[PDB]
Structures are given as C-alpha cells and as structure tokens.
Design a protein around this nucleic acid. Structure first.
Lengths: 99, 127, 465
DNA sequence: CTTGACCTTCCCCTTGCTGGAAGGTTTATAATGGGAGCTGTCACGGATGC
DNA sequence: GCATCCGTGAGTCGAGGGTAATAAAACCTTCCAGCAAGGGGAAGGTCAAG
RNA sequence: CUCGA
C-alpha cells in the first residue's frame, strides 16, 4: 500500500438493511494509523492505531479548539433577526433547495 | 595486614604462605571475624627468616625446627652451630660429587671434532 | 483494566513520594533511635554480661582503633560488674541503691564497638529464653482453660499472682468450679512443668514481671526500626528501575532485574552510614548494580557458566570489539592471543564454551510446519539387525558348549559370565570346585584348545567380523 | 592336581612448590517512571454487561 | 433482554534449503592436579617343574 | 518461504 490517505467503504455486511459506512484511514510510512469511521447512528469515531473506539471530536478538542470554533469549521450558519418583536429570518435561495 | 601485603614485604608467593601454614612450619595466624588471615610482626619475622633459610640452602624440615629454635627464648646455640656445620658439610658432600661429575665428563669430551661422519667416539662408549 | 505487570508495579510505586536531602537524615535518625533502644535495653540482661565476658576475654590474649582503647574500655566494667553482681542480693533486688547500680552497669556498658553479628547474637540469645517462658505459660493456659475448664477471668487472679511458687496452684481451687476440682488426676503436669519455669528463673536470676518489659522494649525498638526502614526502601523504588533499564540484555525479563535490585537496595539500606555527609544515591547504586550483575551471571543461562569464566569471556569480547575498529578485519585467535598475552589453545578453549542452545521448536527453513525437533536422530537405540545377530550368537554359544562334558562347561560359563548373574574371578571360581587356582586356569586352557580345534568352531568363524 | 616364581595393570606415595578452578565479599560526589509492536479476513457461538 | 465483545476454526502428501547476537573489578577462601623420577604395594594372570 | 499432484 502506498502511504497517504485512503477512503474506503464496506458494501454492507456490518449492519442490516444496507447503511454503508464510509471509513477513512491515514497510512504513514512509519507511525500510528489514524482512522475515521461512521456509525449506524450517523456519528463519527476515531480509532488510533486500531485501538478501541472513541468519539471523533475528542481529537478536535485536543487541538485547542472550543466548541464554538468546531461548529464554525464544519457548518454553515443561518442568521435570524428579531426587530420590533418580529420573527424574520434571512434566506439565500441556495440553502432552501428541496424541502 | 592481609596475605598480599606480606607478599610484598618479604617476597614469598601468596600460595607459599598458605603452604607453610598447611605443613608445620610457622605460627598460625588469627582470623578477623571472617575468613581472612591477619598478620603481625612475629609472622613477618618468621617468614623473612624462612625465605633467607630457603635461599642459603636449608631444606624444609631442618628449617622447620630452626624456626622453633628461633621462637623459644632459650636457643642454646650449641645445636644451632651443630646444624649449621652439618649443613655446610652437606654442601661439601654435594659439591664434591658434582665436581666429580665435572671431572668424569671432561675426560670424554676431548675427542669428537664434529665432522659429517657417521661414527662418534662418545656414542660408542655408553652403548 | 490492564494485564501488563510493569504498569501495575509502577502504578503501585507511584503513590509514594521522593525524599529530599534532610529526609534521608531524618529516616537515618529514626533507624539509629530504633536500634539504640535495643542497645540500651539489653544492658539489663545476663546475655550482655556474657557478651562483656567474651569480648574482654578475646582481647585478653591480644577508624581502626588503638589497642590501648580496647584495653581501657573493657577493663573497669568487670570490677563494676563484680560490685553490682553481689549487691543486688543485698536486702532487695530493686532498691534505691540497687537500681542505681543497675543504671550504673547499664550506662557505663556503652562500650559498643558494634559489629552486627555480635549484636544480633544477644537478641538470638534473649528470644529463645522469652520463647521458653512463653511456651511454658501457653502450656499452662492450654491445660487450665481447655482441659480443667477454669475461666480466664478466674485464671488471671493468680497466674499474674506469683508464677514462682505453687500458691497459685492450690489457692484458686478453694473456689471449687467442680470441673476444676478434678485435679488429683492431672496435678502431675502443671507443677512439674512449673519446675521448668523455676529453672529458667534460677538461670536468669530475674523474676517474671521484670523480664517481660525487657522484651516489650525489644519489640518497640525493633518495630520502630522496621517501620523506619520500610519508608526509606519504598521511597527510593524509582532508583532501581532507573538503574535496571540498561541490563535488559536478553537473559532475564525486565521484572526480574527490578526484583533483584530491590534486594540489593534492602542490603544497601542497612549498610548506609549518614555520618559521612554522602547522599543515599551515592551509596546504593553500587549495591543495586552488584545484585543485578550477580543474578544475571548466576541465572539467565541454560548451561550455567561460573562467575570467573564470564570475565574471561568478556575480556576476549572487549578486545575483539577493539580489534575490529583498529585493524578493520575480524581477528584470528593467533593474533588475538598476542593482545590477550595468553596461549593460543587457551583462547581456542574459551571460544568453545559459549553459544547457548537452539530451541528445538525453531523452524529451519522459513516455514512453520518443520521444526528443528523433527530432525534429531535417536542414537541410543540398538539396531534391529544388531539385536537379531546377538540372539543367534547366544544360541550358537549355548549349542557348542554342550559337547564339553561336565567341568569345563560350568567353569567356562561362569568364567566369562555366560548365563550367570555376574562374573567370577579366578579364586572365587577356584573356591567352588575344590580349592585350586592354577587347576582352573589349566582347565580353561584345555577348554580353549578344545574349542579352537576346527570341528566345532566352524560355525563361530563368521560371527567374528 | 600342586608350589613358588615371576608377569600384568592400577592406586598411592615421596618435595617445594605452582597453576588453575569454583565460591564469597566489598566499593561512599551524584545518578529516582519501559518500549515494541501491532494495523490487508470471515464467520460464527456464546459469555457479558448495562 | 439485547447490542456488543471476545475465543476458535480455516485440505493432504512429497522436494530444498538450514544450524543466529553484545556488554566489571579488586580482594579473600578451599580444593585439586602436576611436575622434576621413580618406589611401594595390591588384586589378577602365566610358567615351569614336580 | 519457493516448487510439484
């Protein structure tokens, strides 16, 4: 195997009723094998060097990130406005597409 | 004063002192709350007497009674002079026989010049 | 939640704290005050008198001390003992003047010259006497409570009473307790065993009450000494795992080096003097390194090499390490003996002892189904063709001896041990027939001349080669 | 068949040590928490632990 | 009770090659062998007459 | 480990 990054996916065979789980490895030429994988509860998980499972944002808090910056790095904010006791949101048309 | 420091004062081997303790020659030394020989000046005097007695020509047993004639305070020196005169008489008896070997060996080493021959006048006498 | 034992050991040693510079001085003062109670409390016992007697009578016939100090510190104590020994019997054992002479013979007794064998000798003397009186008291307690059934509340009213005379034996039976009025059959054990305790009384000269506080002081001082030593041992338990990192050269496992270094540290604690102004890590490193390097040369080898041969191997290996850097070529033994200043056959002898054995389960290709233990031929077995000819030879020897008639057959069979339990010599077989030694040999020679004639030994020609 | 005379090998012994083997005991500036090895199989049965 | 975690399996028979690495030092003690030439003796084996 | 059925 060449060193680098590698996105793999089992075709089934873990949980019933489909639910393909896309894992993701990082193979170095020498060192530990950082690993990411999903879950049937659609969570994220980290397996450092094929040890036991661990919630994946615990490697983000270790990198000196607060839980405000973690949500800023991954998501896309929708701003609300409250003026004279009115509930009016902002809306770009690209977000609301197919609901 | 252990067994290695008395080897440098007199000159004996460290095994030879244990040998002289094994046979009956010297005063037995004390132990030091463990298996270690300790030595005082009396054993030093006995050993520097015995090394000189070995170097002048006495054997192990007449020196073995010479040391006992040195330990006691009496040493009535008539038998001392008797044993020294017996020793120099023994040296005379050895040296007369050894020079007799010399005289009997010089009378046969006259011939035999040392050529490439196959006969020798020396190899034929004793054969 | 773990199974690695080294994590368990380091987690267990992690709870304790390291020591500072003055902490070791504090624990050394604790150890010295633990042993000083045993030193100043043994001065009221006749075993200390025996120690004084032997230690001055040893120097009677005789920093390193001057001999005049040894002639001075062991001289006046004998005369003071002479004045103290008879005056305890004068009008009372523990008086205002007799106990002052007790403190006199105790405080001038500090003439220590303390060597630990002649210090532990007195404790080994006292402990067996206290165990003697303890087994006598426990046999009394075993007979009276468990067999005579008298209660311990009514037992301590007179067991603590005298323990010298038999007033305790016949005074508490005024109260009947009629299971314990049954003593006229079982009288003959308790007073006859109390004669032994009276013998111990007359041997020590001191009573029952005034000897138990001595051993209580011994127990207090010894417990203080052990509890002082335990903290110094447990505090420096990181120094041993700091030293045993390096000796993990693969003879022993990692934990065995630590367990040998702990015994080295426990030897180093009892030897360490704090008077010289040296820190403890200056001293204990030697006693840890010695214990590890001793166990790694006595153990950790299958064919065990003695200790002095390891030095002869290691000098050769250090010189053979230096010769590769110097010359650049691998040294032959002939030029190696020039550096070692040894005969060459000696160096060829030392280069044979090594190479610890191969495991019989190792694979000799690159496989995992063919181990080395499937190639080793058994050589002790007798061959099946050499075990079939040795029966035909036995049958042919049983055949050809039948033509020999009556005397030469038996002496030929038991002369060579044929069909006998063992072999017989010439005189042991001469004593069987009549007496004769030479006649047996003549019969043997005639029998061999009968066998060698070519009319019977034609079959035994082809058994030869 | 019997007696003494001779043979064999083998074990112990004579001095004045010396060489070697196997075992035990210390040494005082200061040193205070390991590291090697594993990741690219699949399919069960059945303990186990909230 | 049920998701999850751990133990145990995974074809037979023949060839050939193999069978490796590196780690103190001064002191003390007892015991055994050997060596310069034989001497001595003890437990077995033969010889030549009678 | 490589090879043969």
């Amino acid at each position: 195997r060449s060193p680098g990054v590698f996105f793999d996916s089992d075709k089934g065979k873990t949980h019933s009723s489909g639910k393909v789980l896309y894992n993701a490895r990082i193979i170095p030429y020498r060192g530990s094998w950082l690993d990411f994988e999903f879950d049937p509860k659609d969570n994220l998980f980290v397996r450092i060097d094929r040890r036991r499972k661990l919630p994946a944002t615990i490697i983000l808090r270790a990198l000196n990130y607060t839980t405000e910056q973690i949500l800023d790095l991954f998501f896309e904010k929708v701003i609300f406005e409250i003026r004279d006791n009115k509930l009016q949101m902002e809306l770009v048309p690209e977000r609301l597409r197919g609901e | 004063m252990n067994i290695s420091d008395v080897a440098k004062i007199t000159g004996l081997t460290s095994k030879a002192i244990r040998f002289y303790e094994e046979k009956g020659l010297v005063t037995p030394p004390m132990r030091s709350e463990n298996g270690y020989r300790t030595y005082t000046q009396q054993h030093l005097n006995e050993l520097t007497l015995l090394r000189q007695a070995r170097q002048v020509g006495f054997n192990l047993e007449e020196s073995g009674e010479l040391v006992n004639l040195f330990n006691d305070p009496q040493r009535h020196s008539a038998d001392v002079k008797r044993r020294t005169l017996e020793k120099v008489a023994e040296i005379e008896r050895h040296i007369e026989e050894l020079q007799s070997m010399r005289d009997q060996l010089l009378a046969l080493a006259n011939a035999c010049p040392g050529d490439d021959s196959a006969d020798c006048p020396i190899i034929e006498n004793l054969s | 939640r773990t199974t690695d034992p080294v994590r368990m050991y380091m987690r267990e040693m992690g709870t304790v704290e390291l020591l500072t510079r003055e902490g070791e001085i504090d624990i050394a003062k604790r150890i010295e005050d633990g042993i000083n109670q045993v030193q100043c409390s043994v001065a009221e016992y006749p075993e200390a008198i025996t120690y004084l007697l032997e230690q001055y009578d040893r120097v009677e016939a005789e920093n390193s001390i001057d001999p005049e100090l040894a002639r001075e510190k062991f001289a006046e104590l004998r005369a003071q003992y002479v004045v103290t020994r008879d005056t305890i019997k004068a009008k009372g054992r523990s008086h205002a003047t007799a106990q002052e002479e007790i403190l006199k013979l105790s405080e001038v007794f500090k003439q220590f010259r303390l060597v630990p064998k002649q210090f532990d000798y007195l404790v080994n003397s006292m402990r067996v006497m206290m165990d003697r009186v303890r087994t006598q008291e426990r046999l009394i307690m075993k007979l009276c409570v468990e067999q005579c059934k008298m209660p311990k509340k009514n037992f301590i009213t007179l067991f603590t009473g005298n323990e010298t005379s038999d007033t305790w034996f016949n005074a508490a039976i005024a109260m009947n307790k009629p299971w314990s009025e049954k003593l006229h059959d079982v009288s003959e054990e308790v007073h006859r065993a109390l004669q032994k305790l009276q013998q111990i009384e007359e041997e020590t000269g001191l009573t029952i009450e005034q000897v138990k506080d001595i051993n209580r002081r011994m127990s207090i001082g010894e417990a203080k000494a052990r509890r002082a030593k335990k903290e110094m041992v447990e505090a420096n338990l990181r120094l041993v795992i700091s030293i045993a990192k390096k000796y993990t050269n693969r003879g022993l496992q990692f934990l065995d080096l630590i367990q040998e270094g702990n015994i080295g540290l426990m030897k180093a604690v009892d030897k360490f003097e704090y008077r010289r102004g040296y820190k403890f890590s200056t001293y204990a490193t030697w006693w840890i390194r010695q214990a590890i390097t001793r166990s790694i040369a006595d153990q950790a080898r299958t064919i065990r090499i003695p200790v002095h041969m390891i030095e002869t191997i290691n000098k050769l290996n250090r010189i053979s390490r230096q010769m590769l850097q110097e010359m650049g070529r691998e040294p032959t033994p002939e030029e190696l003996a020039e550096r070692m200043l040894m005969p060459e056959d000696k160096i060829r002898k030392v280069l044979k002892i090594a190479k610890e054995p191969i495991s019989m389960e190792t694979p000799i290709g690159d496989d995992e189904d063919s181990h080395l233990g499937d190639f080793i031929e058994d050589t002790t077995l007798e061959l099946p063709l050499d075990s079939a000819t040795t029966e035909s030879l036995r049958a042919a020897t049983h055949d050809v001896l039948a033509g020999l008639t009556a005397r030469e057959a038996k002496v030929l069979r038991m002369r060579f041990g044929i069909d006998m339990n063992t072999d017989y010599t010439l005189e042991e077989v001469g004593k069987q027939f009549d007496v004769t030694r030479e006649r047996i040999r003549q019969i043997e020679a005639k029998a061999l001349r009968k066998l060698r004639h070519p009319s019977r030994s034609e079959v035994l020609r082809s058994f030869l080669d």
